[PDB]
Design a protein around this ligand. Structure first.
Ligand SMILES: NC(=O)C1=CN([C@@H]2O[C@H](COP(=O)(O)OP(=O)(O)OC[C@H]3O[C@@H](n4cnc5c(N)ncnc54)[C@H](OP(=O)(O)O)[C@@H]3O)[C@@H](O)[C@H]2O)C=CC1
Ligand code: SF4
Ligand code: SF4
Ligand code: SF4
Ligand code: SF4
Ligand code: FES
Lengths: 121, 115, 164, 688, 101, 100
């Protein structure tokens, strides 16, 4: 009674299935759904940065990937994006428990990365 | 209040986070914004246009921005020969910010005492 | 006693709408469009008279027909016409003169007022009555005390007690 | 009645309310809209946000108006100094740990917390301590979590327990460290899992496909209908120019209450891919772009060079009534009679509307105390209808099922699985018949998978005998219901879109057409479109039907046109254009009127109002939009009239009564092109 | 090719802001007949490319004739050089010759 | 018998009525007393009974090539609507045929 459904035998068109926008690690699990709008579809552009940057110029995402995560003592960190709090972003409180150098926590305003060796680990 | 410009953090990441507040406050409707999420999960623009022939140079966009991303810089000498040279897209505004960043920071070190 | 928004300037707006001689002004069909001076093909388009429902994202009721006597909520809307993209920038282009005039400026207290405006201007109209909210809750979870009632799993049987 | 309406006083105004109403409902009946965060009309009362605090006379404390019942002669005050101080204090407590996230939050512009802080709160804060920070949770591809913005209203938990039925969310921890979610990494598997994003009053739960793309103030909203199934849920389409940005439900208590399935909510991204925007004619090189005059001429030449008996017209699942009556009149004007429907049972008799519609209606089904489902899976056919069935289950309506056993998120009694079990139920061998015979208002719901069967007439005769014996249809109550799963089927049955007797005979002896008109059909059988035939495809997506065609005529999608659709209860509803036509496409009835002019026999209508008047001339209930007639019931005279169809094609008592929907997330050309639906399927495949 | 030139990319009702789908190169565009032809094409929403040999003052009247980005001006045209002719027609599906003496 | 003839003269028959009106009483009586016998003679003939509140009682015959004729039968008796159906049968012989 109530037989299980086999999802693996469900057909998906190959044009649709190969065009899913997904994410690299960053602020999500790697490989989850990436939100997109219609801009760039007529020109065949499936990438975020290519929609406004032209050439082999260094992207902002490649700039922030070169800054290493920062070791912070404690359980919560406050992120302003600047030494002066008037000159940065609104303050962001980022959880640091469960974080390491390999899996750090990222600020949603600045893209800076933080971790703590204080959660008994 | 001179030529509009888009700014970065000292790391090189954009300050703008596509909140669309500067587009909402603009009385001339001189700003057009589209956005989606970047491949690392960040919230960033894919289009940021400023029609400089529609702009009134009020500075309200500079006031509405919560992350100091859009500014009006100290440049007033930017007359062109074609009108298509005055429809700025996102790349040119970032190029303006990369040109004028040190002067903008020097100005904002004084004007942050008042704002 | 009578107190229906009796502390603001809307008292001085409800009267001045019922001043004698001016409360009985009336025109024939399509006559107000002849004296409006706008092109006559504008009145060949179709209009919709409707009160927009509450947005799903929020719980407040202020922009609904619940507060119909307090606030004008009925709208006049027109069908869309062609849009395309600008080749140089990508901006959305249009040739529609009635693209935002019904959604920004024309608001009415009742359905019949919007109908009267459409009739004297010459617009052909369709009227859409909004869907009425239901306030009565379900039989289960009718009150807060039904969360903890005996309807969860019945009356408990006292057969596992010591001495049975 | 012993004064079933009691009188209370709200700000010294007398208000009559029904008995059992709370203080908040009495305030709502007085024209006052009390601020709230945890109360919902469709959920159970919680009473934990403390925002609805009002003052009642002879009570020294503020009462929670959502939970407190209203007594006789009660005096409620909503604008005293203690009420305003209470509102400001509760708002200040709500905002001390909230993150400064309004620029990056998607609720900014349509946020209950923002607007209630602006109106009922203060303008300052005195809090300079560090805030609470929470890690985010993974709940699948449709729900995005930023859990630092949670305000612990527990609307999500109550929704998942009460409406969705899955009951997978909970509150773990205690105190300030209370934390919403699943303890282990799990995926939200409900079909109604996008509704919790609407139910969350803050940006803790937002829509992942929609994320960071638009603000709510930029969107032009259009009230339309949903065509992804046969219920016709009422929706609002939000567009920015030519692009549809999101789809939301809107209230209709007779149809969908406030809900919408995930397919109807998230399939809009298929409207940006594989779109037909130009007419094409197949040349020696293949299909290539042609003018409208050339494409109409080629279609007319193929339609006129063939004999009238070699022409077949197939309607799709999403064709509106105007285009269907246009194609029907155009093909009948040429002397053809071969009409087919992509949704199956094209030869089904459509003489009385009560035999293929839900006579009880959707809201009238709630007055039934016992429900018998025959051969249907309502969770995959219409999840909003199945949610209303669960709502009926929660307040006492018992459910039995004859069919293949399925997960329905409520307990049911499995009477059987085949028409042999149906005959045993009608005779009296199963004790569920005595449960039906003693019920005050029994109901029978027959699904579309029964009507797709080759022996559907014998099964319907057995169902009619069961309804006659169990008192399902009597004076004052009609409990016989037939539901559908396709948007265009009931309108085609209403107008008479069916093949003639000669065409049915020619299909019986195996005649094959040479010209096929595909009105938006992409799930046709291979028996109906022969190889080497001339195919005219009229539609909006490039799919199986357009890759095979010789002439392609681009039409409108349901977000671009205003066409009529009838749901399975008989209610006439209409779409509305939220965006203009794409490219060089046209209106769908207009293509057929132009094609009838190029053929040589014009259709007698030149406007949208005129083709709607033609529809009202065929069946007069088409003119009454947003309403449903009471259909005529002819007792057993109709079943006596079609006994020849019962004698021929006899009963198959061993084939199980199943549901034909095997792919819920991809049912038509729009949902097959949606990348979000493909990610939804991939998420259920990677969990094994 | 046949009538796909005037129908396939036509966007808008046909005014100054609309799109006709025609990219045209007019040689001798600053002349007597060429100016009227360039005005006729550009007012319906076509992109017009205009190479010229003369000074810019004698070609400035062509700048007004179309919307932003749709009149393209290429000075210092040498018709004995094939590179100028190749650059001027590199995006056009219509070529109109008004060069004469 | 007229019932057996009601598959060759016309391609379809449409009956319009109101559920509760006084003028649609004879049509409703005719349908109740005659639908089973008119459908038993030919099981594949489409007889579209369609109802709406407050409409006029009407019979409609659809012939070949999309042709259609209508007769108003409001206030008529069962014998009268039977008669009007019979003259709807009679005009079907002088119509052009299709299918072949
Ligand atoms: N009634 C008429 O005028 C008739 C005209 N025609 C033809 O129609 C065309 C338009 O004539 P119309 O406009 O009246 O004459 P114009 O002299 O006004 O136009 C000739 C154009 O060709 C350009 N041109 C001439 N020689 C050269 C060269 N060696 N290199 C580059 N560009 C050159 C000129 O540019 P620049 O300003 O630099 O000289 C000028 O813009 C002509 O070619 C003519 O043969 C045909 C029949 C009748
Ligand atoms: S300075 Fe004024 S006109 Fe210019 S972009 Fe800002 S708000 Fe708009
Ligand atoms: S520039 Fe500033 S205000 Fe404008 S969208 Fe970006 S972050 Fe928002
Ligand atoms: S939920 Fe989002 S938009 Fe609302 S107040 Fe919090 S951060 Fe701002
Ligand atoms: S996630 Fe949203 S609905 Fe759930 S408890 Fe938090 S605020 Fe309430
Ligand atoms: S709405 Fe009553 S306590 Fe939350």
């Amino acid at each position: 009674v109530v037989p299980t459904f086999d999802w693996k035998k469900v057909p998906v068109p190959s044009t649709t299935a190969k065009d899913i926008p997904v994410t690299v690690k960053g602020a999500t699990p790697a490989g989850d759904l990436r939100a997109t709008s219609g801009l760039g579809l007529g020109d065949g552009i499936k990438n975020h940065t290519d929609k406004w940057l032209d050439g082999d110029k260094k992207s902002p995402m490649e700039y922030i990937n070169e800054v290493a995560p920062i070791k912070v003592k404690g359980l919560v960190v406050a992120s302003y994006g600047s030494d002066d709090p008037a000159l940065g972003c609104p303050v962001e409180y980022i959880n640091l428990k469960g974080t390491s150098l390999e899996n750090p926590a990222v600020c949603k305003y600045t893209g800076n990365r933080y971790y703590s060796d204080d959660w008994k680990g | 209040r001179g030529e509009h410009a888009l700014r970065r953090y000292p790391t090189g990441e954009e300050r703008c986070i596509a909140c669309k507040l500067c587009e909402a406050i603009c009385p001339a409707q001189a700003i057009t914004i589209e956005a989606e999420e970047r491949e690392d999960g960040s919230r960033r623009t894919t289009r940021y246009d400023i029609d400089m022939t529609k702009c009134i140079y009020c500075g309200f966009c500079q006031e509405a921005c919560p992350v100091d991303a859009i500014v009006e810089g100290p440049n007033f000498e930017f007359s062109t020969e074609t009108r298509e040279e005055l429809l700025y897209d996102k790349q040119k505004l970032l190029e303006n910010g990369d040109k004028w960043e040190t002067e903008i920071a020097t100005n904002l070190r004084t004007e942050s005492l008042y704002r | 006693e009578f107190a229906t928004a009796s502390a603001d300037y809307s008292i001085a707006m409800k009267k001045a709408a019922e001043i004698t001689g001016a409360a009985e002004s009336a025109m024939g069909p399509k006559e107000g469009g002849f004296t409006a001076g706008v092109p006559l093909d504008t009145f060949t388009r179709k209009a919709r008279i409707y009160a927009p429902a509450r947005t799903a994202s929020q719980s407040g009721l202020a922009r609904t027909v619940d507060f119909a006597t307090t606030t004008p909520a009925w709208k006049i809307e027109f069908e869309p016409t062609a849009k395309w993209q600008n080749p140089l920038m990508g901006w959305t282009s249009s040739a529609d003169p009635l693209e935002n005039v019904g959604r920004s400026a024309l608001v009415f207290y009742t359905k019949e007022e919007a109908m009267r405006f459409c009739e004297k201007l010459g617009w052909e109209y369709e009227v859409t009555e909004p869907n009425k909210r239901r306030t009565q809750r379900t039989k289960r979870y009718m009150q807060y005390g039904d969360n903890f009632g005996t309807k969860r799993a019945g009356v408990p049987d006292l057969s596992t007690l010591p001495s049975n | 009645p012993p004064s079933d309406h009691l009188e209370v006083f709200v700000n010294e105004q007398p208000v009559k309310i029904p008995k059992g109403s709370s203080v908040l409902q009495a305030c709502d009946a007085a024209g006052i809209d009390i601020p709230r965060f945890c109360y919902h009309q469709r959920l159970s009362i919680a009473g934990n946000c403390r925002m609805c605090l009002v003052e009642v006379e002879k009570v020294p404390k503020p009462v929670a108006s959502c939970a407190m019942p209203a007594g006789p002669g009660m005096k409620i005050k909503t604008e005293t100094p203690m009420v305003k101080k209470a509102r400001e204090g509760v708002m200040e407590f709500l905002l001390i740990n909230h993150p400064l996230d309004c620029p990056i939050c998607d609720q900014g512009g349509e946020c209950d917390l923002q607007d209630q802080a602006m109106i009922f709160g203060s303008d300052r804060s005195r809090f300079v301590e560090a805030k609470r920070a929470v890690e985010d949770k993974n709940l699948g591809p449709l729900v995005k979590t930023v859990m630092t913005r949670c305000i612990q209203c527990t609307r999500c938990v109550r929704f998942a327990s009460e409406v969705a039925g899955t009951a997978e969310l909970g509150v773990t921890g205690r105190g300030r460290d209370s934390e919403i979610g699943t303890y282990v990494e799990k995926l939200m598997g409900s079909e109604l899992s996008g509704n919790v994003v609407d139910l969350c009053p803050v940006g803790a739960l937002t829509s992942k496909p929609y994320a960071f793309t638009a603000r709510s103030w930029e969107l032009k909203g259009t009230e339309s209908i949903d065509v992804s199934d046969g219920l016709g849920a009422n929706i609002r389409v939000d567009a920015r120019g030519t692009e549809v940005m999101r789809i939301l439900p809107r209230l209709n208590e007779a149809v969908n209450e406030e809900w919408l399935s995930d397919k109807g909510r998230y399939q809009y991204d298929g409207l940006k891919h594989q779109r037909l925007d130009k007419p094409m004619v197949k040349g020696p090189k293949g299909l290539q772009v042609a003018t409208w005059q050339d494409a109409l001429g080629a279609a007319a030449a193929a339609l006129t060079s063939a004999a009238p008996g070699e022409v077949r017209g197939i309607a799709g699942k999403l064709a509106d009534a105007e285009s269907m009556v246009a194609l029907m009149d155009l093909l009948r004007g040429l002397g053809a009679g071969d009409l087919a429907h992509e949704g199956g049972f094209s030869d089904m008799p459509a003489d009385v509307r009560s035999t293929y519609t839900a006579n009880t209606t959707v809201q009238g089904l709630e007055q039934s105390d016992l429900v018998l489902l025959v051969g249907t899976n309502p969770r995959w056919e219409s999840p909003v209808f199945n949610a209303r069935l669960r709502k009926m289950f929660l307040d006492g309506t018992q459910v039995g099922l004859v069919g293949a056993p399925v997960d329905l998120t409520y307990k049911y009694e499995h009477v059987g699985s085949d028409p042999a079990a149906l005959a045993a139920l009608a005779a009296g061998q199963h004790p569920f018949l005595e449960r039906l015979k003693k019920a005050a208002r029994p109901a029978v719901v027959v699904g579309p998978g029964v009507l797709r069967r080759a022996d559907r007439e014998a099964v319907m005769k057995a169902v009619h005998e069961l309804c006659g014996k169990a008192g399902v249809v009597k004076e004052g109550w009609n409990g016989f219901n037939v539901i559908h799963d396709t948007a265009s089927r009931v309108a085609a049955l209403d107008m008479g879109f069916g093949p003639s007797a000669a065409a049915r005979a020619r299909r019986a002896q195996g005649a094959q057409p040479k010209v096929v008109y595909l009105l938006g059909s992409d799930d046709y059988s291979e028996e109906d479109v022969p190889e080497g035939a001339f195919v005219i495809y009229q539609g909006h997506h490039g799919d199986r039907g357009a890759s095979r065609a010789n002439v392609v005529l681009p039409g409108a999608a349901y977000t671009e046109k205003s066409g009529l659709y009838v749901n399975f209860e008989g209610r006439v509803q209409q779409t509305r254009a939220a965006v203009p036509l794409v490219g060089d496409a046209r209106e769908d009835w207009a293509i057929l009127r132009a094609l009838s002019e190029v053929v040589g026999k014009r259709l007698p209508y030149d406007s949208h109002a005129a083709v709607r008047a033609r529809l009202a001339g065929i069946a007069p209930h088409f003119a009454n939009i947003d309403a449903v007639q009471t259909p005529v019931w002819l007792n057993g005279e109709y079943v006596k009239g079609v006994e020849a169809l019962a004698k021929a094609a006899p009963l198959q008592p061993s084939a199980p009564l199943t549901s034909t929907i095997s792919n819920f997330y991809m049912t038509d050309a729009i949902s097959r092109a949606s990348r979000t639906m493909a990610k939804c399927i991939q998420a259920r495949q990677q969990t094994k | 090719y046949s009538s796909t030139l005037m129908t396939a990319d036509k966007l808008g009702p046909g005014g100054r802001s609309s799109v006709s789908g025609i990219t045209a190169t007019v040689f001798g565009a600053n002349g007597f007949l060429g100016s009227y032809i360039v005005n006729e094409l550009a007012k319906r929403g076509s992109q017009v490319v205009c190479p010229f040999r003369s000074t810019e003052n004698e070609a400035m009247h062509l700048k007004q004739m179309g919307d932003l980005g749709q009149i393209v001006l290429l000075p210092e045209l040498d018709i004995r050089n094939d590179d100028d002719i190749k650059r001027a027609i590199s995006r056009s599906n219509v070529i109109i010759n008004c060069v004469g003496m | 018998a007229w019932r057996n003839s009601l598959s060759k003269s016309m391609q379809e028959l449409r009956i319009h009525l109101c559920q509760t009106s006084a003028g649609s009483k004879g049509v409703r009586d005719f349908i109740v007393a005659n639908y089973a016998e008119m459908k038993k003679a030919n099981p594949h003939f489409p007889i579209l009974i369609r109802e709406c509140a407050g409409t006029e009682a009407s019979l409609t015959a659809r012939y070949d090539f999309g042709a259609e004729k209508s007769v108003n039968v409001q206030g008529a008796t069962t014998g009268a609507v039977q008669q009007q159906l019979e003259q709807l049968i009679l005009a079907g012989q002088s119509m052009p045929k299709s299918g072949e």
